[PDB]
RNA sequence: GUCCGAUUUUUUCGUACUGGAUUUCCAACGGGGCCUUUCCUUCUGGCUAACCUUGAGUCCUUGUGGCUCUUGGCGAACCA
């Protein structure tokens, strides 16, 4: 949120969910944050360095949180053949 | 839902998405459209011929592979019934069961299924008259009814 | 679930679904060519048939009718088309 | 008379006087390829750039006719895509399209719906193709603004157009200015 | 029976976005669905979407993306005197700042910020944020 | 450019008003037009083709009326 003079008010803007792109409550304390490890030449997680996720306290309530991974990790290439579109 | 019961079947006929074809057919219009009149005059009704024609001379339907629907063709052929088919079984039926209702007084289930078909006919019947295919009066009427089936 | 393409669906659960309900709905039923062994004429019947199909003429029989698909008579031939 | 020009219906052109001379060319193969190939007569022909090194020749049919020119259509096209190398030959019945009547755009004894733009429109896809029925057909609305029609053809005889695939989307996009892709099964 | 369509329509909408759900089947399909739902991707609250050919009256397959709130109609289509579209908007629309109205004048179906400078004004169709 | 309280607090350091035309230097926005098979429907005006026609002429491996002048009829189309 903008102000008078494109100067930025608001005090905090929100996380968004990865899979249903819907804001994360402050207090949203089934939502989750998951990091995942990216790799180097074999093996060798490299720290610090992150491939990194966020799912919605409703998505994870409903039991899809594991799926929604699926189709999340295929996307930023993470798992081959796991994920199906058709179904 | 269903009109009269509390019926949600839905039995129905699901057509192809083919306004033409089969690549099998190969018979010509004129040669089955020669088919329709010829069970036409032998005192047929389009449902009943449609049913024939599908079962057995392959014909998938009559709409597609003549362009024109079955009753159109009896029409134009000059072998259009007088009332339609539609009402002709329903005032048949009502017909009957008025015939049972009179052997049988106390049948007090066909008297209420009575009314049933009956309002069935007038509601179909209204629209008949609304599109000109019945004469702007006509009226099902309890006591002639029997002569129109026979 | 949460996200599928419903487009394209899988031939083997479209082919699951009920009649009505796969995608653009169609029909299940075919047609068949039909002739009894001693008979070189090619009788072309349709597979719910709710019609006693007989062979050009001698009184034979074909299929007969049920509350599905319709019953072929005895010893006869067919390919489905 | 003359076999020539009166094949044709109108006193111009060039490319249509040449494929009239290629026409009387196979008409000249009497007992079929003439009985069937003299009543068969065409209005006019456009010309249309394609994607590839290649053009594309539209021949406008009466209409009334046109299930004549789909009783060789295979042959003929053949024959034409012989003598006319380079080229992608495609038959079209000129269809009438009459407006949405309107308050101003008004006319009397209504108007059939095969006189309609989207009947007409469908009408050209169908011919595009000829042979090979059309399976199913979408139109992809596109987050930016603007549509574009998925025309599904058969498995059949697909061999007649798998190459003029790429040259009838110009084709139908420079007679009605929405635009093709195509598809099989999948 | 089915009756407005429209509104079968975006209750399907509504109701996925409600779930969680990236995609809807919608039927049947109206010209004055497609419109609409133009108009709602033309501010991003939908993504793509694609008619399908039943030789009938219409599917449609809808991509969300979040975001949406409520996508409504409002049934009956009432008349709103130009000067009372203040105040649809006033009624149901979440903050000035943004949300819109959209109706069907005869210049067109279109959402409110249009009919305002377009200065046309009509019958309310719904509603999206 | 000049009206005006000039702000963080140092100097040639930074704020409500007006003017701005035509630009390829981007944008959004509305108004009126056309072309794409689409001004249709009615009526009046315009110019007039073609069509018939009187009269005088010419061609033909055929009365085939072709073609040109000419008398007064009829106003496709197109424009308003
Ligand atoms: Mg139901
Ligand atoms: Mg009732
Ligand atoms: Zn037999």
Same mark, same amino acid.
């Given at each position: 949120?903008?102000?008078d003079?494109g100067?930025? $008010?608001?005090?905090?803007v929100?996380?968004?969910?990865?899979?249903?792109?819907?804001?994360?409550?402050?207090?949203?304390?089934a939502?989750?944050q !998951?990091?995942?490890?990216?790799?180097?030449?074999?093996?060798?997680?490299?720290?610090?360095?992150?491939?990194?996720?966020?799912?919605?306290?409703?998505?994870? =309530?409903?039991?899809? +949180?594991?799926?929604?991974?699926?189709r @999340?990790?295929?996307?930023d290439?993470?798992?081959?053949?796991?994920?199906?579109? =058709?179904? | 839902?269903?009109?009269?019961?509390?019926?949600?079947?839905?039995?129905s +006929?699901?057509?192809?998405?083919?306004?033409?074809?089969?690549?099998?057919?190969? @018979?010509?219009?004129?040669?089955?459209?020669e088919?329709? $009149?010829?069970?036409?005059?032998?005192?047929?009704?389009?449902?009943?011929?449609?049913?024939?024609?599908?079962?057995?001379h392959?014909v998938?339907?009559?709409?597609?592979?003549?362009?024109?629907?079955?009753?159109?063709?009896?029409?134009?052929?000059?072998?259009?019934p007088?009332?339609?088919?539609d009402?002709?079984?329903?005032?048949?039926?009502?017909?009957?069961?008025?015939?049972?209702?009179?052997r049988?007084?106390?049948?007090?289930?066909?008297?209420?299924?009575?009314?049933?078909?009956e309002?069935?006919?007038?509601?179909?019947?209204?629209?008949?008259?609304?599109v000109?295919?019945?004469?702007?009066?006509?009226?099902?009427?309890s006591?002639?009814?029997?002569?129109? $089936?026979? | 679930?949460?996200?599928?393409?419903?487009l394209?669906?899988?031939?083997?659960?479209?082919?699951?679904?009920?009649?009505?309900?796969?995608? *653009?709905?169609?029909?299940?039923?075919?047609?068949?060519d *039909?002739?009894?062994?001693?008979?070189?004429?090619?009788?072309?019947?349709?597979?719910?048939?709710?019609?006693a199909?007989?062979?050009?003429?001698?009184?034979?029989?074909?299929?007969?009718?049920?509350?599905?698909?319709?019953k072929?008579?005895?010893?006869?031939s067919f390919?489905?088309? | 008379?003359?076999?020539?020009?009166?094949?044709?219906?109108?006193?111009?052109?060039?490319?249509? @006087?040449?494929?009239?001379?290629?026409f009387?060319?196979?008409?000249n193969?009497?007992?079929?390829?003439?009985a069937?190939?003299?009543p068969?007569q065409?209005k006019?022909?456009?010309? !249309?750039?394609?994607?590839?090194?290649?053009?594309?020749?539209?021949?406008?049919?009466?209409?009334?006719?046109?299930?004549?020119?789909?009783?060789?259509?295979?042959?003929?096209?053949?024959?034409?895509e012989?003598?006319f190398?380079?080229?992608?030959?495609?038959?079209?019945?000129?269809?009438?399209?009459?407006?949405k009547? +309107?308050?101003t +755009?008004?006319?009397?004894?209504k108007?059939?719906?095969?006189?309609?733009?989207?009947?007409?429109?469908?009408?050209?896809?169908?011919? @595009?193709?000829?042979?090979?029925?059309?399976?199913?057909?979408?139109?992809?609305?596109?987050?930016?603004?603007?549509? !574009?029609?998925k025309?599904?053809?058969?498995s059949?005889?697909?061999?007649?157009?798998?190459?003029?695939?790429?040259?009838?989307?110009? *084709?139908?996009?420079?007679?009605?200015?929405?635009? !093709?892709?195509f598809?099989?099964?999948? | 029976?089915?009756?407005?369509?429209?509104?079968?329509?975006?209750?399907?909408?509504?109701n996925?976005?409600?779930?969680?759900?990236?995609?809807?089947?919608?039927?049947?399909?109206?010209? $004055?669905?497609?419109?609409?739902?133009?108009?709602?991707?033309?501010?991003?609250y939908?993504?793509?979407f694609?008619?399908?050919?039943?030789?009938?009256?219409?599917?449609?397959?809808?991509?969300?993306?979040?975001?949406?709130?409520?996508?409504?109609?409002?049934?009956?289509?009432?008349?709103?005197?130009?000067?009372?579209?203040?105040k649809?908007?006033?009624?149901?629309?979440?903050?000035?700042?943004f949300?819109?109205?959209?109706?069907?004048?005869?210049?067109?179906?279109?959402?409110?910020?249009?009919?305002?400078r377009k200065?046309?004004?009509?019958?309310?169709?719904?509603?999206?944020?």
């Amino acid at each position: 949120m903008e102000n008078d003079k494109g100067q930025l $008010v608001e005090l905090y803007v929100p996380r968004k969910c990865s899979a249903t792109n819907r804001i994360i409550k402050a207090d949203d304390h089934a939502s989750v944050q !998951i990091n995942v490890a990216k790799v180097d030449e074999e093996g060798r997680a490299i720290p610090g360095e992150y491939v990194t996720y966020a799912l919605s306290g409703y998505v994870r =309530s409903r039991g899809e +949180s594991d799926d929604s991974l699926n189709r @999340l990790a295929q996307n930023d290439g993470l798992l081959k053949n796991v994920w199906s579109y =058709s179904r | 839902g269903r009109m009269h019961s509390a019926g949600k079947g839905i039995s129905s +006929s699901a057509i192809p998405y083919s306004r033409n074809a089969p690549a099998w057919f190969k @018979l010509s219009s004129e040669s089955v459209i020669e088919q329709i $009149v010829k069970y036409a005059r032998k005192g047929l009704t389009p449902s009943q011929i449609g049913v024939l024609l599908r079962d057995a001379h392959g014909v998938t339907q009559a709409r597609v592979i003549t362009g024109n629907k079955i009753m159109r063709i009896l029409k134009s052929n000059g072998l259009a019934p007088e009332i339609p088919e539609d009402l002709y079984y329903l005032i048949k039926k009502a017909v009957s069961v008025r015939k049972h209702l009179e052997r049988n007084r106390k049948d007090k289930d066909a008297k209420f299924r009575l009314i049933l078909i009956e309002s069935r006919i007038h509601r179909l019947a209204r629209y008949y008259r609304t599109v000109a295919v019945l004469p702007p009066n006509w009226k099902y009427e309890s006591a002639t009814a029997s002569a129109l $089936v026979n | 679930v949460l996200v599928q393409d419903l487009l394209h669906p899988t031939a083997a659960s479209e082919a699951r679904k009920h009649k009505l309900k796969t995608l *653009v709905q169609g029909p299940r039923s075919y047609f068949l060519d *039909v002739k009894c062994p001693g008979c070189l004429n090619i009788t072309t019947v349709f597979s719910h048939a709710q019609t006693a199909v007989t062979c050009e003429s001698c009184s034979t029989i074909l299929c007969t009718p049920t509350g599905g698909k319709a019953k072929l008579s005895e010893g006869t031939s067919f390919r489905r088309k | 008379s003359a076999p020539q020009a009166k094949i044709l219906s109108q006193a111009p052109t060039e490319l249509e @006087l040449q494929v009239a001379q290629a026409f009387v060319e196979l008409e000249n193969s009497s007992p079929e390829l003439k009985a069937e190939l003299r009543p068969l007569q065409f209005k006019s022909i456009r010309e !249309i750039d394609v994607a590839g090194g290649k053009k594309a020749l539209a021949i406008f049919v009466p209409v009334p006719s046109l299930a004549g020119f789909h009783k060789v259509q295979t042959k003929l096209t053949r024959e034409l895509e012989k003598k006319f190398q380079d080229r992608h030959v495609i038959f079209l019945a000129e269809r009438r399209i009459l407006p949405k009547p +309107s308050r101003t +755009s008004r006319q009397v004894q209504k108007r059939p719906r095969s006189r309609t733009l989207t009947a007409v429109h469908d009408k050209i896809l169908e011919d @595009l193709v000829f042979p090979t029925e059309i399976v199913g057909k979408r139109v992809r609305y596109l987050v930016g603004g603007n549509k !574009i029609q998925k025309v599904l053809l058969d498995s059949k005889d697909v061999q007649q157009i798998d190459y003029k695939l790429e040259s009838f989307q110009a *084709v139908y996009n420079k007679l009605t200015g929405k635009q !093709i892709v195509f598809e099989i099964p999948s | 029976t089915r009756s407005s369509v429209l509104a079968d329509a975006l209750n399907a909408i509504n109701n996925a976005e409600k779930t969680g759900k990236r995609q809807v089947l919608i039927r049947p399909s109206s010209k $004055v669905i497609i419109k609409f739902l133009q108009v709602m991707q033309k501010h991003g609250y939908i993504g793509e979407f694609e008619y399908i050919d039943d030789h009938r009256s219409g599917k449609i397959v809808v991509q969300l993306n979040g975001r949406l709130n409520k996508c409504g109609v409002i049934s009956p289509r009432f008349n709103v005197k130009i000067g009372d579209i203040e105040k649809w908007t006033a009624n149901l629309l979440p903050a000035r700042q943004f949300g819109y109205v959209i109706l069907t004048t005869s210049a067109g179906i279109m959402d409110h910020e249009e009919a305002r400078r377009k200065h046309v004004s009509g019958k309310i169709l719904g509603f999206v944020y």
